[PDB]
């Protein structure tokens, strides 16, 4: 599990059948609410890549390399050949979509992937409704391998075609995209996949990645199959396809989530009892490799209470190894800044984007600590220092992926970020 690659696409161009075309495996769950135009889950696929004097980008199916993103026009390339397909790198594509409702999904599985690919839509209006919104949450978690995955010019008219992408790249000052060059794709016509799908893997090296450090895992899945009227021996833990960021996860590897449910007389944070967890079962995307390489995703099977893994209320819990370097205090500070627009809908008024509502007293707060949105009532918070008030004694490592949500309607907003000391 060496390198992850993340397609990142904002509102309204389509991210279902184009995930089917070039990545192979599409994302599906139960009571899923899977998409309306683009998806709302992590679109993940299982890949083993090989190149055999061939610029094409094949799948672990070892016969052809095409897709199904258009019904009429098929340009195609030299696919490869059979013969017990090989493995250049332990790579696997992942996706991070761009609505503002998936803050759990868009904030938990984005710092844990390795390479990023930002997409530009092709089914939206002449103003840019959400181009400067859905990698600005990825701004603070500081990914490096980022590219403009240029997507749609097919049904795009000529008046809004060849220059406005530069205006989108200039409009994304809150998005780290100036060091993101362009390797284009096509969501419909998928033209000439041997160079189009080539340097999204071939140009991208390993990221800066630590081999043998602590596995300080923020988990992305905790799912379970124990419906009313179930089997007898489903003793498991977090049944997960789990992307890891740091630390080698071998058999017998140690990893701890220290608070979980907060200890007795719940106003302290730690008691010296580590959480012993031996992860043996590890599914390397088509195989059972118990020795997990850092960075890439692997199918993680832990051993904890099975009752606690049915409904994943644990989006982004810190599971870290021995040597408990995370902090112990309940007075959370941040070094924040503000979102300059109040955008997510397009208009020409500049009226809802008037100001930035700061912290107050007798007034609520919520912010995705990693992907955990807690809060409470405040007492006296100053002007330019962010003092987040909470209720959960959690020995989290670094909340360097936070989004200050704020109510204006049925949906919350985006007003802030921040980096932990």
């Amino acid at each position: 599990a060496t390198i992850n690659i993340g397609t990142i696409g904002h509102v309204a161009h389509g991210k279902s059948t184009v995930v089917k075309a070039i990545s192979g495996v599409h994302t599906v769950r139960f009571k899923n609410e899977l998409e309306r135009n683009i998806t709302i889950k992590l679109g993940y696929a299982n890949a083993k890549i090989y190149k055999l004097d061939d610029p094409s980008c094949p799948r672990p199916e070892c016969y052809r390399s095409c897709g199904s993103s258009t019904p009429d026009e098929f340009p195609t390339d030299i696919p490869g050949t059979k013969g017990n397909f090989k493995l250049v790198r332990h790579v696997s594509f992942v996706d991070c979509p761009g609505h503002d409702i998936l803050m759990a999904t868009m904030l938990n599985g984005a710092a844990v992937m390795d390479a990023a690919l930002l997409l530009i839509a092709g089914n939206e209006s002449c103003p840019q409704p959400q181009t400067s919104e859905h990698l600005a949450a990825i701004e603070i978690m500081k990914l490096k391998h980022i590219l403009i995955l240029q997507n749609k010019i097919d049904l795009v008219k000529e008046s809004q075609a060849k220059e406005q992408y530069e205006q989108i790249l200039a409009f994304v000052q809150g998005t780290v995209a100036e060091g993101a060059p362009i390797i284009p794709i096509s969501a419909q016509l998928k033209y000439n996949i041997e160079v189009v799908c080539e340097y999204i893997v071939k140009k991208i090296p390993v990221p800066p990645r630590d081999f043998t450090s602590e596995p300080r895992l923020i988990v992305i899945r905790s799912f379970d199959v124990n419906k009313p009227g179930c089997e007898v021996d489903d003793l498991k833990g977090g049944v997960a396809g789990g992307s890891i960021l740091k630390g080698v996860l071998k058999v017998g590897q140690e990893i701890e989530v220290r608070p979980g449910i907060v200890s007795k007389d719940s106003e302290g944070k730690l008691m010296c009892k580590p959480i012993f967890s031996k992860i043996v079962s590890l599914f390397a995307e088509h195989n059972d490799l118990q020795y997990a390489a850092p960075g890439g995703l692997i199918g993680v099977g832990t051993k904890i209470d099975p009752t606690l893994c049915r409904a994943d209320r644990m989006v982004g819990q810190v599971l870290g190894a021995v040597g408990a370097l995370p902090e112990i205090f309940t007075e959370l500070e941040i070094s924040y800044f503000l979102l300059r627009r109040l955008l997510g809908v397009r208009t020409e008024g500049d009226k809802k984007a008037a100001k930035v509502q700061k912290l107050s007293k007798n007034e609520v707060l919520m912010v995705n600590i990693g992907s955990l949105s807690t809060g409470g009532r405040v007492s006296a918070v100053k002007a330019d220092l962010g003092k987040i008030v909470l209720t959960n004694p959690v020995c989290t490592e670094v909340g360097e992926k936070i989004a200050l949500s704020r109510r204006v309607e049925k949906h919350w907003r985006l007003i802030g970020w921040g980096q932990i000391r």
């Binding site: 026009e73 340009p75 284009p184 016509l189 033209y191 000439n192 160079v195």
Partner: peptide, 16 residues
Amino acid sequence: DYTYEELLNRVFNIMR
């Protein structure tokens, strides 16, 4: 890249 200019030389002879 040669693929944008490849499309504007090759594939847009039949496309709108």
